[PDB]
Design a binder for this molecule. Structure first.
Ligand SMILES: Nc1ncnc2c1ncn2[C@@H]1O[C@H](COP(=O)(O)O)[C@@H](O)[C@H]1O
Length: 199
């Protein structure tokens, strides 16, 4: 199975070639078609599996590149992962003109540029959400990257608050290496008939 076999088109395929990705990882082969098809996905995988591209590639391909406003919001537990994911998203979109990524963990002028992808930690995202500097009215895709870690670090209240402010019509991808009950409950509250992927 190739990346083109998963339904990815030339701009993303070219970025993958620039990055030296030769073939999809298992989590990518399983998750990418579901997300391209507009499903919610519960992905059980950890760093090293390729989970970042698994959620990033399909949601990038699915956005409106001419809409200069946040369409993909990615929640991460740490400044380090937020920055890493934003860098990856920037690399995957290298051949998508006018598509821009912001990491929030300087922040004001980031959001004023109308980035289509915003990656951040829950506390800092929730600050800009309350301030109105973060517009989620046009959001199409929500990712929780390491939901179990956000729970464990004490951030789940803020995660829930963010998730309850998102407009009805959106895709959700939730990635978690483990499955605490509180994450099961988040899946039931906030996701629509999710495809569960554990290999
Ligand atoms: N399909 C792939 N082929 C080669 N390297 C990859 C692939 N997908 C992800 N990677 C790399 O694998 C590492 C783990 O990614 P992640 O699991 O998303 O943190 C990162 O260094 C990625 O650049």
């Amino acid at each position: 199975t190739t990346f083109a076999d998963l339904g990815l088109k030339a701009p993303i395929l070219e970025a993958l070639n620039d990055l030296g990705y030769e073939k999809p990882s298992p989590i990518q082969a399983e998750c990418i078609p579901h997300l391209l098809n507009g499903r919610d996905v519960l992905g059980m995988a950890q760093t090293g599996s390729g989970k970042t591209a698994a959620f990033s590639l399909p949601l990038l391909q699915n956005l409106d590149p001419e809409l200069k406003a946040p369409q993909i919001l990615v929640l991460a537990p740490t400044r380090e992962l937020a920055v890493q994911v934003a860098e990856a998203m920037t690399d995957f979109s290298k051949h998508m003109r006018g598509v821009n990524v912001v990491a929030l963990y300087v922040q004001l002028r980031a959001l004023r540029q109308g980035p289509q992808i915003v990656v951040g930690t829950p506390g800092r995202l929730l600050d800009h959400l309350k301030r109105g500097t973060l517009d989620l009215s046009k959001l199409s895709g929500l990712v929780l990257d390491e939901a179990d870690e956000m729970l464990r670090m004490g951030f789940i209240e803020d995660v829930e608050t963010i998730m309850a402010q998102i407009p009805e019509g959106h895709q959700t991808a939730l990635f978690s290496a483990t499955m605490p009950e509180a994450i099961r409950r988040i899946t039931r509250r906030f996701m629509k008939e999710p495809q569960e992927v554990r290999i």
